[PDB]
Scaffold this active site. Structure first.
Site, mmCIF file in Angstrom:
data_model
loop_
_atom_site.group_PDB
_atom_site.id
_atom_site.type_symbol
_atom_site.label_atom_id
_atom_site.label_comp_id
_atom_site.label_asym_id
_atom_site.label_seq_id
_atom_site.Cartn_x
_atom_site.Cartn_y
_atom_site.Cartn_z
ATOM 1 N N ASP A 39 0.874 -1.200 0.000
ATOM 2 C CA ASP A 39 0.000 0.000 0.000
ATOM 3 C C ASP A 39 0.901 1.237 0.000
ATOM 4 O O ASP A 39 1.629 1.420 0.987
ATOM 5 C CB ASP A 39 -0.933 -0.005 1.211
ATOM 6 C CG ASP A 39 -1.851 1.201 1.266
ATOM 7 O OD1 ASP A 39 -1.820 2.008 0.314
ATOM 8 O OD2 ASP A 39 -2.594 1.316 2.251
ATOM 9 N N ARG A 41 0.165 4.122 0.547
ATOM 10 C CA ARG A 41 -0.293 4.960 1.694
ATOM 11 C C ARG A 41 0.195 4.400 3.039
ATOM 12 O O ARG A 41 0.096 5.137 4.032
ATOM 13 C CB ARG A 41 -1.819 5.055 1.730
ATOM 14 C CG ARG A 41 -2.404 5.953 0.654
ATOM 15 C CD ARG A 41 -3.895 6.138 0.830
ATOM 16 N NE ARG A 41 -4.384 7.167 -0.076
ATOM 17 C CZ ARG A 41 -4.854 6.953 -1.303
ATOM 18 N NH1 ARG A 41 -4.930 5.726 -1.794
ATOM 19 N NH2 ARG A 41 -5.260 7.977 -2.032
HETATM 20 C C1 LIG Z 1 3.869 1.190 -11.751
HETATM 21 C C2 LIG Z 1 2.755 0.228 -11.460
HETATM 22 C C3 LIG Z 1 2.009 -0.369 -12.455
HETATM 23 C C4 LIG Z 1 0.997 -1.238 -12.105
HETATM 24 C C5 LIG Z 1 0.135 -1.930 -13.119
HETATM 25 N N1 LIG Z 1 0.732 -1.506 -10.817
HETATM 26 C C6 LIG Z 1 1.508 -0.880 -9.923
HETATM 27 S S1 LIG Z 1 1.117 -1.275 -8.252
HETATM 28 C C7 LIG Z 1 2.451 -0.507 -7.319
HETATM 29 C C8 LIG Z 1 2.240 0.971 -7.084
HETATM 30 O O1 LIG Z 1 1.742 1.395 -6.052
HETATM 31 N N2 LIG Z 1 2.666 1.751 -8.096
HETATM 32 C C9 LIG Z 1 2.665 3.163 -8.176
HETATM 33 C C10 LIG Z 1 3.656 3.774 -8.931
HETATM 34 C C11 LIG Z 1 3.687 5.150 -9.047
HETATM 35 C C12 LIG Z 1 2.732 5.924 -8.421
HETATM 36 C C13 LIG Z 1 1.738 5.333 -7.660
HETATM 37 C C14 LIG Z 1 0.690 6.169 -6.989
HETATM 38 O O2 LIG Z 1 -0.577 5.722 -7.479
HETATM 39 C C15 LIG Z 1 -1.688 6.489 -7.248
HETATM 40 C C16 LIG Z 1 -2.879 6.030 -7.806
HETATM 41 C C17 LIG Z 1 -4.048 6.740 -7.624
HETATM 42 C C18 LIG Z 1 -4.045 7.924 -6.885
HETATM 43 N N3 LIG Z 1 -5.230 8.660 -6.690
HETATM 44 C C19 LIG Z 1 -5.958 8.713 -5.543
HETATM 45 O O3 LIG Z 1 -5.828 7.900 -4.634
HETATM 46 C C20 LIG Z 1 -6.917 9.821 -5.469
HETATM 47 C C21 LIG Z 1 -8.069 9.919 -4.680
HETATM 48 N N4 LIG Z 1 -8.685 11.070 -4.887
HETATM 49 N N5 LIG Z 1 -7.946 11.727 -5.802
HETATM 50 C C22 LIG Z 1 -8.336 13.050 -6.266
HETATM 51 C C23 LIG Z 1 -6.875 11.011 -6.173
HETATM 52 C C24 LIG Z 1 -2.846 8.370 -6.325
HETATM 53 I I1 LIG Z 1 -2.793 10.135 -5.202
HETATM 54 C C25 LIG Z 1 -1.673 7.656 -6.509
HETATM 55 C C26 LIG Z 1 1.706 3.947 -7.548
HETATM 56 N N6 LIG Z 1 2.512 -0.025 -10.163
#
Ligand SMILES: Cc1cc(C)nc(SCC(=O)Nc2cccc(COc3ccc(NC(=O)c4cnn(C)c4)c(I)c3)c2)n1
Ligand SMILES: [Zn+2]
Length: 290
Positions: A39, A41
């Site tokens: 996570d 977060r």
């Molecule tokens: C690179 C990749 C590809 C795939 C297919 N799976 C994964 S799972 C591993 C992982 O956590 N990767 C990851 C990498 C970079 C950035 C992030 C950040 O992701 C997010 C996503 C959404 C949100 N949005 C919300 O929460 C949200 C709510 N309200 N609002 C207005 C926005 C956010 I802030 C961040 C995650 N990773």
């Protein structure tokens, strides 16, 4: 009241009754931790980039002018394998048995799609890395995850092949609206829901968390989560979960890992062998492609 008792056993008997036809799943990061996807977060799971504030790396304006830090983090957090958990396959069984109305997910890992949930069955509330789009308003060329993964691992800022603009993963950055699909599906689905299955979310991110208050008053709500969640905050509180008061009538908390909770529920429903066979088959298939 629709549950004969406020237990997993009560929920199972309700699910096997003619009254329970349409299940909505609300899921968060807790359904993917057993798949080895931390996570983002979680405290337990970038200074060189000079971020004005920590959360600027997920803010749309900063990303459009400085996308390098985000793509560097994307490569570092990229999972080594995409193997859905028992919880993900439990939702596939709900779809197979004609019980799944919709799965609202806050995850961007695409495990729901890999487990067999189709786009029609899904509301990716916080977007997804499954597809990416060129940010130019007149272009918006769509790129698949295979294309975006190559750019992320090559450390090449992804640019559109048609217009050379930045290509952004379809996640909801801070400063972006939740997808229209979220609000329109919520407005229709919560008229029809017989059971709310809330799994692997602390219900602390809005407006996703507020979905529990959109359930009809009679609709049983089962939380499968490591910690009790969704009760009105005694400070902020000045349609929350009521598990433990003498007025409790429909909310059940099963406290533990989502995989263990879904296995326990599948077992009560007579689905344990089906779930074991599905998971072992799909895991074998994924292991052989990996
Ligand atoms: C690179 C990749 C590809 C795939 C297919 N799976 C994964 S799972 C591993 C992982 O956590 N990767 C990851 C990498 C970079 C950035 C992030 C950040 O992701 C997010 C996503 C959404 C949100 N949005 C919300 O929460 C949200 C709510 N309200 N609002 C207005 C926005 C956010 I802030 C961040 C995650 N990773
Ligand atoms: Zn373009």
């Amino acid at each position: 009241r629709l549950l004969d008792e406020l237990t997993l056993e009560g929920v199972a008997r309700y699910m096997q009754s003619e009254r329970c036809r349409r299940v909505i799943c609300l899921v968060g990061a807790g359904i993917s931790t057993s798949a080895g996807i931390p996570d983002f977060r979680s405290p337990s799971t970038l200074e060189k980039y000079h971020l004005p504030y920590p959360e600027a790396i997920f803010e749309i304006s900063y990303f459009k002018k400085h996308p390098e830090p985000f793509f560097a983090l994307a490569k570092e957090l990229y999972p080594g394998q995409f193997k859905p958990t028992i919880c993900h396959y439990f939702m596939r069984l709900l779809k197979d048995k004609g019980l799944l109305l919709r799965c609202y997910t806050q995850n961007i890992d695409t495990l729901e799609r890999i487990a067999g949930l189709e786009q029609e069955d899904l509301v990716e509330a916080h977007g997804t890395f499954y597809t990416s789009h060129c940010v130019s308003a007149s272009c918006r060329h769509e790129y698949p995850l295979s294309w975006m993964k190559e750019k992320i691992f090559s450390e090449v800022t992804p640019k559109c092949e048609d217009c050379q603009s930045l290509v952004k993963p379809d996640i909801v950055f801070f400063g972006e609206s939740l997808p229209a699909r979220f609000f329109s599906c919520m407005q229709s689905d919560f008229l029809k829901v017989d059971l709310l299955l809330v799994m692997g979310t602390s219900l602390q991110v809005q407006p996703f968390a507020s979905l529990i208050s959109k359930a009809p008053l009679s609709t049983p709500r089962l939380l499968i989560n490591k910690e009790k969640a969704g009760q009105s905050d005694p400070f902020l509180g000045m349609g929350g979960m009521d598990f433990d008061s003498k007025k409790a009538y429909r909310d059940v908390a099963w406290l533990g890992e989502c995989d263990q909770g879904c296995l326990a529920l599948a077992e009560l429903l007579g689905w344990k062998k089906e779930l074991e066979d599905l998971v072992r088959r799909e895991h074998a298939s994924i292991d052989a492609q990996s």
